Design a protein around this ligand. Structure first.
Ligand SMILES: Cc1c(C=C(CO)CO)n(C)c(=O)[nH]c1=O
Ligand SMILES: Cc1c(C=C(CO)CO)n(C)c(=O)[nH]c1=O
Lengths: 309, 310
């Protein structure tokens, strides 16, 4: 079978993900690489009206005291469903085309602006840290994360907080801190799981980044530490089983991902070349049918045309 | 080489049976070869949030009275449905790796109170019909319906509307309001669901028949696809956006491989129990994937019941 390379560019907004991605795509002949872009049209028009604006307005109103936490939570939960929809459908229709992990060049490279976990895990977790989502809803989103397809390469981003702030300022610091922390925790969680970490065994070590390499992180430095919330704990002090099962699901979904960290602290071309070097260690898969490749290409471009800026 | 499992999802519009029927299902679970995963009412009232059912029925009542906007209702209904479906979704996710291919009596019969589609498709669709959920949010839920595993046996109920109204009036849930418009919406959605599975299983192609919504198997107008001719989902030229069309492809793939069985509730609780048992004769069993799968499943089910069963 022909092989496919799927790369999800993810991590906090405002680091240079989109520019870097576009530059990499530009290196290729038109047909050997396809970009599945940020579905901004869905978010602004098709799925609802101006979802990004509604999200930031709601946080501000919460921080202002103009609305309750309960009010903010219903809006954020509802908005995240809208945010995530294009990711989730794309995954669902891609799935039957993806074979086992397969190296000679891929017939097709597919590059995504974000993975489903952005909308179903990372942004909800950060909203939770900001007090505008309940941890129960975060775990409900976790339970709905689709089964992790073979060859799921995710690229996260590193950038000094000062440079990140400036970059964002030139073009909500608590939210920026929150999302940066969540993605750092994510990277550690994947490493923890691939080093054989069992959250149930280490749960009691709780009380108070990089994948790809390094030693096993402490559970206190992974996403698992976020869910010690009193909302989730029974009178005896343990997690209710329903929430423990969501953490089992979190573990299963993350542990088979291939995570890479891109240093965005350089020029656009430098980021591009760094991303290119990173793809040399990424996992390809076979496809299901010979016609899978043109189908995937059509799917991505259709997506791009309809939901892209 | 692995033992066999029978999964049975008791679903359909709520309020058709009796708490006597339920007690028999609990009593049915007394056997060593059967476990009954009950309604996670404790999750909905306390664990996942506070009085979710009440929230739902109050929100619709106030939309109907004009005390809140449709938009306000929709954000509440959407987030409440997330809470409602969470126990179904985690359960399915943890059970999924234990399920093998299709497979004489089964080693274990697992009987669930509802399938994830109740909270990710059917109730959201009914609320769309009640004007309290956007059709975009419904398709977002559809996009997250877990893959349909082998041996997905779903039992839906038949009962005359008058008798259903009667039974429902006598067993309202905490915070529930007796809404005849909602009863009609939910009954229609489940009727459309049943037709949809047939349409699909008889080779129906929604993309091919789509034009007939504006012009042997059910007519597409008698399936769930008719709901998604909603104008919110259409371009200025009337075409469905691809993103929603893809969600309908997912809907078709999820529904086609479900095995649907209709339980006549117009009888006694004991009758209903016997009817359900016999129905299992035509249900599809699967293998489990590991020797330790059976006892793991049992543990999950028992733990679920004890923690979230009322
Ligand atoms: C994906 C995602 C985002 C991020 C973007 C939209 O501004 C682009 O990075 N944001 C900001 C959010 O609040 N929720 C989300 O699910
Ligand atoms: C499953 C489900 C129900 C049904 C039940 C809860 O009362 C009955 O089991 N209801 C009433 C609802 O509003 N949303 C749902 O997702």
């Amino acid at each position: 079978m022909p092989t496919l390379l799927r790369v999800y560019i993810d991590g906090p907004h405002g680091m240079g993900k989109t520019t870097t991605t576009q530059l990499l795509v530009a290196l290729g002949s038109r047909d050997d690489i396809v970009y599945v872009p940020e579905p901004m049209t869905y978010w602004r028009v098709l799925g609802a009206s101006e979802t990004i604006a509604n999200i930031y307005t709601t946080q501000h109103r919460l921080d202002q005291g103009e609305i309750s936490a309960g009010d903010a939570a219903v809006v954020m939960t509802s908005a995240q469903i809208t945010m995530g929809m294009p990711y989730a459908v794309t995954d669902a229709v891609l799935a039957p085309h993806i074979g086992g992990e397969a190296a000679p060049p891929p017939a097709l490279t597919l590059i995504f602006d974000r993975h489903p976990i952005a909308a179903l895990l990372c942004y909800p977790a950060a909203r939770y840290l900001m007090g505008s989502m309940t941890p129960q809803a975060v775990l409900a989103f976790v339970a709905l994360i689709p089964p992790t397809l073979p060859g799921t390469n995710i690229v996260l981003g590193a950038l000094p907080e000062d440079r990140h702030i400036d970059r964002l300022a030139k073009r909500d610091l608590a939210m920026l801190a929150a999302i940066r922390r969540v993605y750092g925790l994510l990277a550690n969680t994947v490493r923890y799981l691939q080093c054989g970490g069992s959250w149930r065994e280490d749960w009691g070590q709780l009380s108070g980044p990089q994948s790809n390499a390094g030693p096993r992180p402490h559970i206190g430095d992974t996403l698992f530490t976020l869910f010690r919330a009193p909302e989730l704990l029974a009178p005896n002090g343990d997690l209710y089983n329903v929430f423990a099962w969501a953490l089992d699901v979190l573990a299963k979904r993350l542990r088979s991902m291939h995570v890479f960290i891109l240093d965005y602290d350089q020029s656009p071309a430098g980021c591009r070349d760094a991303l290119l070097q990173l793809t040399s260690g990424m996992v390809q898969t076979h496809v299901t049918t010979p016609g899978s490749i043109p189908t995937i290409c059509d799917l991505a471009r259709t997506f791009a045309r309809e939901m892209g800026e």
